[PDB]
Amino acid sequence: SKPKILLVEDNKINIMVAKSMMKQLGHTMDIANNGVEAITAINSSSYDLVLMDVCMPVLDGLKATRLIRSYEETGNWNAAIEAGVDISTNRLPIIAMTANTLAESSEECYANGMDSFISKPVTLQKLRECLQQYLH
Amino acid sequence: MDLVQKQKSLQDYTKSLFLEGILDSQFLQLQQLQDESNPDFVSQVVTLFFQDSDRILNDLSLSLDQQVVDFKKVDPHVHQLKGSSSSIGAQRVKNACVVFRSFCEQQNVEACHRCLQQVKQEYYLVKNRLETLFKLEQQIVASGGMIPAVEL
Ligand SMILES: [Mg+2]
């Protein structure tokens, strides 16, 4: 049972780099390009870890995380439905990837329900440190 | 045609780019990922960078030429270029984009024009230097030589 990992990121360069780093660490990942795609993936698969970009179009990672936490609390996606998202007790580890701006403090990540964060640019050592704590 | 001197020249050239601030240590992360399991990885990532960034710079150029400048159309382009540059270690492009975002925030159109020109100058510089890096590597490899792997 290899751990299942979801990468949520809108920047294609960032995806190619993170994919190769994770491969060297022995992991493959599913890819979502915005919060709506993340929710679609999460609704249909059971992940062991989600790496969640903060700033994305359509639905950002902070709102997506709140909606996933609401789902975990209530058992349904009604918060997401009310927020306009189209949708057809085991707390997901969600790690923010932040971009060094006022709009992306670690405290803000935490206030939207993220468990931890990695400061971009992602490096092998930053990923390693994260995986060794959150993947068993 | 001395391969030992070619390889030393390539090391010195690479070191110069770091000293000059054109590349930062994130570029080394990319070089570390390139191995027998991933042989052209750096060039592949950098080529994607150029493809995407060429398109962004043309889009930004159109957006700043419009009679009424929609800054909500401009900023996402500067943001994307900042992120991409950061992730390949194009430090001077990244820093020019950080300054650009400041003047986008303040809605200052004249400053933004100047910032766009600067980003272009830095982008064309790093493009020239990285295209040349790959040219030097390919020369050595096609001559039966080798680039030692970055084991950092
Ligand atoms: Mg993003």
CATH topology name of chain B, in short, is Four Helix Bundle (Hemerythrin (Met), subunit A)
Structural class of chain B: mainly alpha
Silhouette of chain A: globular
Q: What's the β-strand tally of chain B?
A: 0
Sheet bearing the most strands of chain B, described? none
Number of helices of chain A: 6
Q: How is this structure best described in words?
A:
Chain A: Mg(2+) binds at residues 10, 53, 55. Chain A: Residues 4-135 form the Response regulatory domain. Chain A: Interacts with AHP1, APH2, APH3, APH5 and APH6, but not with APH4. Chain A: This is Histidine kinase 5. The complex is a heterodimer of chains A (136) and B (152). With 136 residues, chain A is α/β, with parallel strands linked by helices. Chain A has helices at residues 12-24, 35-44, 61-74, 78-82, 106-111, 124-134, and strands at residues 5-8, 30-32, 49-53, 94-98, 116-119. In chain A, α2 (35-44) runs parallel beside α3 (61-74). The longest helix of chain A is centred in the middle third of the chain and has 14 residues, at 61-74. Chain A is globular. Chain A starts with a strand and ends with a helix. Chain B has 152 residues and is mostly helical. Chain B has a single domain (1-152), classed as Four Helix Bundle (Hemerythrin (Met), subunit A). Chain B has helices at 3-19, 25-33, 41-65, 71-88, 91-105, 109-142. In chain B, α1 (3-19) packs antiparallel against α6 and α5 (91-105) packs antiparallel against α6 (109-142). Chain B is elongated, with a radius of gyration of 18 Å. Chain B starts with a helix and ends in a 10-residue tail after the last helix. The A-B interface holds A 11-14, 16-17, 20-21, 23-24, 55, 57, 99, 120-124 and B 26, 29-30, 32-33, 38, 41, 44-45, 48-49, 52, 76, 79-80, 82-84, 86-89.
Layout of helices and strands:
The complex is a heterodimer of chains A (about 140) and B (about 150).
Chain A: E1 5-8, H1 12-24, E2 30-32, H2 35-44, E3 49-53, H3 61-74, H4 78-82, E4 94-98, H5 106-111, E5 116-119, H6 124-134
Parallel strand pairs in A: 1-2, 1-3, 3-4, 4-5
Chain B: H1 3-19, H2 25-33, H3 41-65, H4 71-88, H5 91-105, H6 109-142
Helix pairs in contact in B: 1-6, 3-4, 3-6, 4-5, 5-6
Bound molecules: magnesium ion.
Magnesium ion (MG) binds near residues 11 and 55 of chain A.
GO molecular function, one term (chain B): histidine phosphotransfer kinase activity
Subunit structure (chain B): Interacts with the B-type response regulators ARR1, ARR2, ARR4 and ARR9. Binds to ETR1, AHK2, AHK3, AHK4, AHK5 and FBR12.
Subcellular location (chain B): Cytoplasm, Cytosol; Nucleus
